[PDB]
Structures are given as C-alpha cells and as structure tokens.
Amino acid sequence: ETCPIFYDVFFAVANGNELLLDLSLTKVNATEPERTAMKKIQDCYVENGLISRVLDGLVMTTISSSKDCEICPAVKRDVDLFLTGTPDEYVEQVAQYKALPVVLENARILKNCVDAKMTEEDKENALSLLDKIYTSPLCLE
C-alpha cells in the first residue's frame, strides 16, 4: 500500500526477473544507464541464490512494517546506505531492525556484491532512478 512502485521494483530486482524490472523502469522514465545500474543490483541477487533473496526480503518487510514506518524515510535510508554507505554502516543499520546473525551475514554479502559490481557511475544512476521511483504518482498516489 505504501509506495507500490518501489515494492514492484524491489520484487523485480530481488527475484531476478529481467522483464518485470524493465516493465517497471519504463513507467518511471528510466535512462539506459539507470537500467544498467539496476540490472547490476539485480545480478547480485541472482548470483547469491534463493535463500539470500528471501532473507533480504525479510529485512525489507521488517523495516517497511516497523514502528517508525510516500516511501517510509527508514526504507529510503536503508537503500541509501546499501548503495553509498560503507558495509559496516549498512549492516549496522540492518541490525537496528533485525539483528539475527545470518540476516546480517547475508546483508554484508549482498552489500559487498553491489559495491564490487557497481561503478561510481552505476551507483549515481541507481540513486537518480530511485528518486524517479519515490516521486512517481505510482508511489505517492
């Protein structure tokens, strides 16, 4: 119910479905470098397997349904840290919501993957794309 298009894109990214990702990105006017960036994030989910994708879904669901939850500011912060924070900063933030050790280990693996896979240009473009998500009428209306 909150910001549906964000969760549509998350679902696409985390499940590794290229079609669903491309269909949603079209709706928010994604550029080619934005598509490229998001597909790299998606590749990290694909490479780390099904249980990893489940655990990351768990994190998204507990942050999203937390007490301190337009996109919930805590969700945006989680995504901002995932993309631009240090691994320690991102993982520390996850531990505030779900400090189960395999969840934190998994979070660190995905974080290390996106940091390794994405260039500075990819990271910039992921952030501009996420702004198109948060300001979409598919998010706010």
Domain ranges of the chain: 1-141
Resolution (Å units): 1.9
Q: How far is CA 130 from CA 77, 97, 105, 106, 135, in A?
A: 12, 22, 25, 23, 9
Residue among 138, 132, 124, 120 at smallest CA distance from 5: 138
**Could you give the CA distance from residue 127 to residue 37 in angstroms, rounded to a whole number?**
9
- The alpha helices in 28-119, defined as continuous H runs, are 32-64, 73-84, 87-95, 101-117
60: its two tokens: 């998204």
CATH top class, domain 1-141: mainly alpha
**Could you give the CA distance from residue 98 to residue 78 in angstroms, rounded to a whole number?**
13
Question: Dihedral angle at the C-alpha atoms of 83, 5, 105, 68, nearest 10 degrees?
Answer: 90
The 10 Å Cβ neighbour count of residue 110 is: 23
Method: X-ray
- One-letter amino acid for residue 104 of the chain: L
Q: How far is CA 119 from CA 12, 81, 103, 125, in A?
A: 21, 16, 26, 10
